[PDB]
Amino acid sequence: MKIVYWSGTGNTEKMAELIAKGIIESGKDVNTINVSDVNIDELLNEDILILGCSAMGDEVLEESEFEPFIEEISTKISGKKVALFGSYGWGDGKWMRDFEERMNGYGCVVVETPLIVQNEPDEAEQDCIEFGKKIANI
Numbered sequence: 001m002k003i004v005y006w007s008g009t010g011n012t013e014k015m016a017e018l019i020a021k022g023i024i025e026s027g028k029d030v031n032t033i034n035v036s037d038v039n040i041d042e043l044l045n046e047d048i049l050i051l052g053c054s055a056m057g058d059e060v061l062e063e064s065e066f067e068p069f070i071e072e073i074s075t076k077i078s079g080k081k082v083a084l085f086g087s088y089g090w091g092d093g094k095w096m097r098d099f100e101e102r103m104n105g106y107g108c109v110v111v112e113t114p115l116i117v118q119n120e121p122d123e124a125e126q127d128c129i130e131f132g133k134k135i136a137n138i
């Protein structure tokens with residue numbers, strides 16, 4: 001499987017590592033890729049797309065790297081299964097509700113409830129691991 005993410009201070013990156021750990025513990029293989037290093041064509045061969053990005057201003061996806069990537073793959077992912085995650089600061093997850101609505105609008109099947117954690121995982125570490133374990137049971 002593959003996990004693609006954008007992280008500005010490392011919070012979503014940490015989430016990505018933990019989710020990967022959960023998938024690996026379930027017996028499966030997975031590679032985490034920062035959005036800057038992604039290859040669209042190889043990504044599109046995946047059964048499940050696990051995408052993460054923190055909440056940027058104001059309650060939107062990061063604009064210089066992540067959004068352009070989402071827009072680029074938007075027309076080629078109808079019918080694909082996707083799982084979403086990301087870290088946020090002071091909001092209540094509005095950016096994630098919009099992210100889910102957007103992927104559904106592109107014809108994707110959002111497989112699990114999006115995983116959102118405030119700031120660095122720390123306390124929510126097992127939660128991140130368990131989310132990966134859920135995706136591995138798909």
Ligand SMILES: Cc1cc2nc3c(=O)[nH]c(=O)nc-3n(C[C@H](O)[C@H](O)[C@H](O)COP(=O)(O)O)c2cc1C
Pocket residue numbers: 006007008009010011012013053054055056057058059060087088089090091092093118119120
């Ligand atoms: C310019 C900027 C805008 C932000 N806007 C929001 C926002 O609208 N809502 C929110 O809850 N957090 C917001 N945050 C906080 C980040 O989502 C939060 O610090 C998160 O933990 C960052 O994770 P990352 O290290 O993976 O980027 C913003 C942070 C920055 C730098």
